[PDB]
Design an enzyme around this catalytic site. Structure first.
Site, PDB file in Angstrom:
ATOM      1  CD  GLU A  36      -3.145  -0.789   2.060  1.00 32.14           C
ATOM      2  OE1 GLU A  36      -2.972   0.049   2.956  1.00 32.14           O
ATOM      3  OE2 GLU A  36      -4.142  -1.557   2.039  1.00 32.14           O
ATOM      4  CD  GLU A  89      -4.437  -5.552   3.680  1.00 34.18           C
ATOM      5  OE1 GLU A  89      -3.285  -5.792   3.401  1.00 34.18           O
ATOM      6  OE2 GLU A  89      -4.745  -4.743   4.610  1.00 34.18           O
TER       7      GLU A  89
HETATM    8  C1  LIG Z   1     -12.718  10.011   1.146  1.00 31.36           C
HETATM    9  O1  LIG Z   1     -12.192   8.725   1.396  1.00 31.36           O
HETATM   10  C2  LIG Z   1     -10.828   8.637   1.047  1.00 31.36           C
HETATM   11  O2  LIG Z   1     -10.026   9.470   1.872  1.00 31.36           O
HETATM   12  C3  LIG Z   1     -10.057   9.043   3.228  1.00 31.36           C
HETATM   13  C4  LIG Z   1      -9.260  10.023   4.118  1.00 31.36           C
HETATM   14  O3  LIG Z   1      -7.850   9.994   3.958  1.00 31.36           O
HETATM   15  C5  LIG Z   1      -9.594   7.580   3.411  1.00 31.36           C
HETATM   16  S1  LIG Z   1      -9.774   7.042   5.128  1.00 31.36           S
HETATM   17  C6  LIG Z   1      -8.266   6.092   5.362  1.00 31.36           C
HETATM   18  O4  LIG Z   1      -8.422   4.806   4.729  1.00 31.36           O
HETATM   19  C7  LIG Z   1      -7.213   4.078   4.683  1.00 31.36           C
HETATM   20  C8  LIG Z   1      -7.407   2.940   3.769  1.00 31.36           C
HETATM   21  O5  LIG Z   1      -8.380   2.040   4.269  1.00 31.36           O
HETATM   22  C9  LIG Z   1      -6.818   3.686   6.088  1.00 31.36           C
HETATM   23  S2  LIG Z   1      -5.228   2.829   6.121  1.00 31.36           S
HETATM   24  C10 LIG Z   1      -5.713   1.139   6.540  1.00 31.36           C
HETATM   25  O6  LIG Z   1      -5.865   1.073   7.947  1.00 31.36           O
HETATM   26  C11 LIG Z   1      -6.114  -0.256   8.403  1.00 31.36           C
HETATM   27  C12 LIG Z   1      -6.552  -0.080   9.845  1.00 31.36           C
HETATM   28  O7  LIG Z   1      -5.522   0.486  10.637  1.00 31.36           O
HETATM   29  C13 LIG Z   1      -4.885  -1.104   8.165  1.00 31.36           C
HETATM   30  S3  LIG Z   1      -4.946  -2.814   8.809  1.00 31.36           S
HETATM   31  C14 LIG Z   1      -4.372  -2.538  10.435  1.00 31.36           C
HETATM   32  O8  LIG Z   1      -2.975  -2.131  10.440  1.00 31.36           O
HETATM   33  C15 LIG Z   1      -2.603  -1.556  11.703  1.00 31.36           C
HETATM   34  C16 LIG Z   1      -1.204  -0.998  11.542  1.00 31.36           C
HETATM   35  O9  LIG Z   1      -0.244  -2.029  11.397  1.00 31.36           O
HETATM   36  C17 LIG Z   1      -2.763  -2.582  12.829  1.00 31.36           C
HETATM   37  S4  LIG Z   1      -2.569  -1.733  14.434  1.00 31.36           S
HETATM   38  C18 LIG Z   1      -0.953  -2.381  14.945  1.00 31.36           C
HETATM   39  O10 LIG Z   1      -1.146  -3.742  15.326  1.00 31.36           O
HETATM   40  C19 LIG Z   1       0.038  -4.347  15.778  1.00 31.36           C
HETATM   41  C20 LIG Z   1      -0.273  -5.807  15.981  1.00 31.36           C
HETATM   42  O11 LIG Z   1      -1.243  -6.018  16.964  1.00 31.36           O
HETATM   43  C21 LIG Z   1       0.534  -3.640  17.049  1.00 31.36           C
HETATM   44  O12 LIG Z   1       1.754  -4.208  17.528  1.00 31.36           O
HETATM   45  C22 LIG Z   1       0.781  -2.188  16.710  1.00 31.36           C
HETATM   46  O13 LIG Z   1       1.151  -1.481  17.907  1.00 31.36           O
HETATM   47  C23 LIG Z   1      -0.451  -1.550  16.087  1.00 31.36           C
HETATM   48  O14 LIG Z   1      -0.098  -0.214  15.658  1.00 31.36           O
HETATM   49  C24 LIG Z   1      -4.150  -3.239  12.799  1.00 31.36           C
HETATM   50  O15 LIG Z   1      -4.211  -4.326  13.716  1.00 31.36           O
HETATM   51  C25 LIG Z   1      -4.433  -3.737  11.367  1.00 31.36           C
HETATM   52  O16 LIG Z   1      -5.762  -4.339  11.284  1.00 31.36           O
HETATM   53  C26 LIG Z   1      -4.657  -1.194   6.678  1.00 31.36           C
HETATM   54  O17 LIG Z   1      -3.375  -1.776   6.409  1.00 31.36           O
HETATM   55  C27 LIG Z   1      -4.668   0.202   5.995  1.00 31.36           C
HETATM   56  O18 LIG Z   1      -4.951   0.008   4.601  1.00 31.36           O
HETATM   57  C28 LIG Z   1      -6.700   4.939   6.955  1.00 31.36           C
HETATM   58  O19 LIG Z   1      -6.475   4.639   8.327  1.00 31.36           O
HETATM   59  C29 LIG Z   1      -7.952   5.775   6.825  1.00 31.36           C
HETATM   60  O20 LIG Z   1      -7.783   7.025   7.582  1.00 31.36           O
HETATM   61  C30 LIG Z   1     -10.351   6.619   2.473  1.00 31.36           C
HETATM   62  O21 LIG Z   1      -9.775   5.324   2.564  1.00 31.36           O
HETATM   63  C31 LIG Z   1     -10.306   7.185   1.039  1.00 31.36           C
HETATM   64  O22 LIG Z   1     -11.040   6.395   0.124  1.00 31.36           O
END
Ligand SMILES: CO[C@H]1O[C@H](CO)[C@@H](S[C@@H]2O[C@H](CO)[C@@H](S[C@@H]3O[C@H](CO)[C@@H](S[C@@H]4O[C@H](CO)[C@@H](S[C@@H]5O[C@H](CO)[C@@H](O)[C@H](O)[C@H]5O)[C@H](O)[C@H]4O)[C@H](O)[C@H]3O)[C@H](O)[C@H]2O)[C@H](O)[C@H]1O
Ligand SMILES: [Ca+2]
Ligand SMILES: [Ca+2]
Ligand SMILES: [Ca+2]
Ligand SMILES: [Ca+2]
Ligand SMILES: [Ca+2]
Ligand SMILES: [Ca+2]
Ligand SMILES: [Ca+2]
Ligand SMILES: [Ca+2]
Ligand SMILES: [Ca+2]
Ligand SMILES: [Ca+2]
Ligand code: NA
Ligand code: NA
EC number: 3.2.1.4
Length: 301
Positions: free
Chosen positions: A136, A225
């Site tokens: 991504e 994904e």
């Molecule tokens: C108008 O609409 C358009 O603009 C909008 C505004 O910018 C955006 S909103 C924007 O969307 C994007 C795309 O979907 C996301 S990014 C998205 O976020 C997912 C959720 O976080 C993640 S999966 C996720 O990954 C996390 C990070 O690694 C982890 S938390 C992590 O976990 C580990 C393990 O437990 C821990 O050790 C760490 O401490 C933690 O930090 C989580 O568990 C995962 O599920 C995905 O990869 C990513 O694509 C933006 O957030 C959002 O603001 C509109 O999309 C656009 O159309």
């Protein structure tokens, strides 16, 4: 049975086909980050997914940053474990260079080239393998023309030197949403696909239309994904809209991998906290997301 049936995959006129030119649609699971939830990625869990869910692909999400491969490359052994399991189980496998916080794929380009050279040397003769070179790309100034396409044009030849034919999935801008930009300026390699990623609780018709624009330019798309939750993780799962997206993908025969196979307490996770890492799950061990996704894969198995 899966790879024995389909063999070598290729792209024909913008869509994924097998060795006889038949449409093929891969449906499966992505791991969560291998540096966090690798316990769920093993032969026995993948065999259970194959036999009980009907998966025909598994995606190994190897984060680069966030404590992943760049800091602790021992995580590459978990990727190898997944690939070897997929070969033994006769299913497809996606090797995902899982950039995210490192939002420009050029941050770790030298490392990505070395990694993909090693993976394609090892596994390039197997039809099972699919390479996903930059999960991504994201940020307002990571774009197809300036950053992503040139990255792909450097990494793809590294793969092709060892593996002339297997599929390569290339990420797109705005968290692999900007497939329309890629479609207007496509790569030359004939066996590439562009990634499109979504969340059912966040993304709707305007992104379906954007995917259709890309498809209309002759680009192939792999939904490598997607989640059933909102991107924020608030409000539970959004299975009404997920079914809209499932139907959309089926009508275009788009392949997909769901995020994700973990017991983390988040709405996109497929498993409940404590679920057995080697599979054999009871219905109580699946989360609401997992229950739905499992049914989606079963009903076409
Ligand atoms: C108008 O609409 C358009 O603009 C909008 C505004 O910018 C955006 S909103 C924007 O969307 C994007 C795309 O979907 C996301 S990014 C998205 O976020 C997912 C959720 O976080 C993640 S999966 C996720 O990954 C996390 C990070 O690694 C982890 S938390 C992590 O976990 C580990 C393990 O437990 C821990 O050790 C760490 O401490 C933690 O930090 C989580 O568990 C995962 O599920 C995905 O990869 C990513 O694509 C933006 O957030 C959002 O603001 C509109 O999309 C656009 O159309
Ligand atoms: Ca072709
Ligand atoms: Ca088509
Ligand atoms: Ca290092
Ligand atoms: Ca570690
Ligand atoms: Ca080499
Ligand atoms: Ca090959
Ligand atoms: Ca260069
Ligand atoms: Ca068309
Ligand atoms: Ca259906
Ligand atoms: Ca189908
Ligand atoms: Na190190
Ligand atoms: Na066409």
């Amino acid at each position: 049975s899966v790879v024995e049936e389909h063999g070598q995959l290729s792209i024909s006129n913008g869509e994924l086909v097998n060795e006889r030119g038949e449409q093929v649609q891969l449906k499966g699971m992505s791991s969560h980050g291998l540096q966090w939830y690798g316990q769920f990625v093993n032969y026995e869990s993948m065999k259970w997914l194959r036999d009980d869910w009907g998966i025909n692909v598994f995606r190994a999400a190897m984060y680069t940053s966030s404590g992943g491969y760049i800091d602790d490359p021992s995580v590459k052994e978990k990727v190898k474990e997944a690939v070897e399991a997929a070969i033994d189980l006769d299913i497809y496998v996606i090797i995902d260079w899982h950039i995210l916080s490192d939002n420009d794929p050029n941050i770790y380009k030298e490392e990505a080239k070395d990694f993909f050279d090693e993976m394609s040397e090892l596994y390039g003769d197997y039809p099972n393998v699919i390479y996903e070179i930059a999960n991504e790309p994201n940020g307002s100034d990571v774009t197809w023309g300036n950053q992503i396409k040139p990255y792909a044009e450097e990494v793809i030849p590294i793969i092709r030197n060892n593996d002339p034919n297997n599929i390569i999935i290339v990420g797109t801008g705005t968290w692999s949403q900007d497939v329309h930009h890629a479609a207007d300026n496509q790569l030359a390699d004939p066996n590439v696909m562009y990634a499109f990623h979504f969340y059912a609780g966040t993304h709707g018709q305007n992104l379906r239309d954007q995917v259709d624009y890309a498809l209309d330019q002759g680009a192939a798309i792999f939904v490598s994904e997607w989640g059933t939750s909102a991107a924020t993780g608030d409000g539970g799962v959004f299975l009404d809209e997920a079914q809209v997206w499932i139907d959309f993908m089926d009508e275009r025969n788009l392949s997909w991998a769901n995020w994700s196979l973990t017991h983390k307490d988040e709405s996109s996770a497929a498993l409940m906290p404590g679920a057995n890492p080697t599979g054999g799950w009871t219905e109580a061990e699946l989360s609401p997301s997992g229950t739905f996704v499992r049914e989606k894969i079963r009903e076409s198995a």
